[PDB]
Amino acid sequence: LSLADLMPRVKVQSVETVEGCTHEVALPAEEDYLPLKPRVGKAAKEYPFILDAFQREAIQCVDNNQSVLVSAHTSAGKTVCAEYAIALALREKQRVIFTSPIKALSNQKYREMYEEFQDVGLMTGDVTINPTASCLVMTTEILRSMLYRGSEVMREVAWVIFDEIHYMRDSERGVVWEETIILLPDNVHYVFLSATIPNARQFAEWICHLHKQPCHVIYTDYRPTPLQHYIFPAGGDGLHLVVDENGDFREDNFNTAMQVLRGPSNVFKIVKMIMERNFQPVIIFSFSKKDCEAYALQMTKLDFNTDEEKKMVEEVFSNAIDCLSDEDKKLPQVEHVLPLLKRGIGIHHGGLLPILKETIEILFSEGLIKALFATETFAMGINMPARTVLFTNARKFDGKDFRWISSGEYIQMSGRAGRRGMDDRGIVILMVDEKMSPTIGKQLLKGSADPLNSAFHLTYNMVLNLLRVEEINPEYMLEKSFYQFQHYRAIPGSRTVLQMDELKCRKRVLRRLGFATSSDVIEMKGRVACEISSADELLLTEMMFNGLFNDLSAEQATALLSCFVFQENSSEMPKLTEQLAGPLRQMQECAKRIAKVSAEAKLEIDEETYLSSFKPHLMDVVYTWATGATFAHICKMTDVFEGSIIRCMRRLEELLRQMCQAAKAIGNTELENKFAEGITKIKRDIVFAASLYL
């Protein structure tokens, strides 16, 4: 039991507004509420359209230099609010940061903002452009690195814009995200952009608790293009309206749809119906890469594009892959997509070559793709809506069980229907292949979005860096996490600081292994771990200090490191020569010892599970790639999707850069040059082709 000495002192003030949005502000309880004042001076930015009420309200917060969370549907125009903050920051000769959860999205946002402000830069784990720009688009991992390293780039930052904060949990950046918010100085102000969430007030209260300033909440359910929701029961012939433009559930038509009950071919039928009724463009969401490719190939009978549209596709496609080497242009996936795209049929999932995924995004965004078969991730793409959204399945598998998709997932995906300007309505069609009650059907089609819940948890890199930095300690970040704040608010009156027991056990591990002293002073070994964030910092450092890397060549080390960034749980194990199986056995022995130390420190951990997380299914793929093979060659060595190979290679290159810094921290120029050589041996060709958005 560790009770908090000082508790949050926050109150929330309601602010009346004209119809069409809600405005609240969390502020320190001891302070008086002061209404916002009219803009002094000219608008930082003007728009060629009439701003909506919620945009004007959010913009007034920025004009008054106060932080604001904007919670609205994707399509309502949240980016307008970010653009005003950027414009105001540049006018004032300040710097502003725009963070996205994903690298792919940062690339898209860099293009969008550069085309608007020019004075824009980009910083991801894969590229750096114009790093002295006034507006820096970056990933949340980069921002975390700059903060923990005290980069002077942050000294002139007046505004930080967090985009799509509701997606931070699913993006794997849940912890990194809260770390950046907690480490930013109190003089910085924020624009948080979120989908509609039921606990927006709670988040603003946390920001107020954190930085001792007001944080506003602008919330609206406004949808510029109303939606109509249909169910297409299996075997049926038509569509049944179950939610009309006004949001009223049609319990009669719903049961009539279930009546038809009381799926490759079904997908073709419904898609064809969509095209005959001029309901296209359509996005067909499937929760499986394979389903996307199968369904797409079933549309080969059809052709959606005009001759002039075919020419545009062909020209764009050739110009895009022209940067590739003649060897990579001939890859089977490259040759397989173009016939589809020419017919207005597209595919979008993580298994795709990034250069093709970006080509397909740009084509769909320009209307040259009328039927896009995509996985859920496509919903997070910017400015790519359709007239119709089709769900091929109402159930998914979250690694646990077949559950109906949540209302939040349905809202996120179904919200990509309705193109403002050229669509009077947005059409949503939910394919249903089994029985389902009106209750859960109303929850799914009419339930509210999911709350934004903290994904914060302790990491060794976090603990060590906070031990390292003077005038701060790991306990500070625990008490200030949103995870801890949600506990305070869910259980009023409780002062118990969660995660303390875990903090003590984790420090015991660090002491027993020489990362820090009994007095929690950081050892040089710990400072090496401070450099590693994208992988298991504890195990990799122990491996470095035990010498596992000293006898390995660059190719062996690179191949061995792939086990720390490869994340696919349904692959077949290849056969490894002793050059790879040897190092793999050494790493596993070391992992066992850490598991032992962890258990004795009283951390919950399973040895076999822990050892299994380091998946070597691409060790040979990576090794052969590093020895100069072609990409076509290494794809033949595995069932792993081409895009999944490239994703692992890109995270591997990112990890290698961190291992260089790790070796550099102790002047070990031997390993530094070795890890750097691995980078030189994998950073080439289509696997590292530049983003089409640059």
Partner: protein, 42 residues
Amino acid sequence: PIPDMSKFATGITPFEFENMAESTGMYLRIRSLLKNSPRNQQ
């Protein structure tokens, strides 16, 4: 509450601008090919 940035910078390797690059001109090249697309006409 949060120590100054200078205190975070001491005892750790600095943040490096890695993977430097410049505009390939690819996007604006693809954009020129798309003057009369279904979205540019509407």
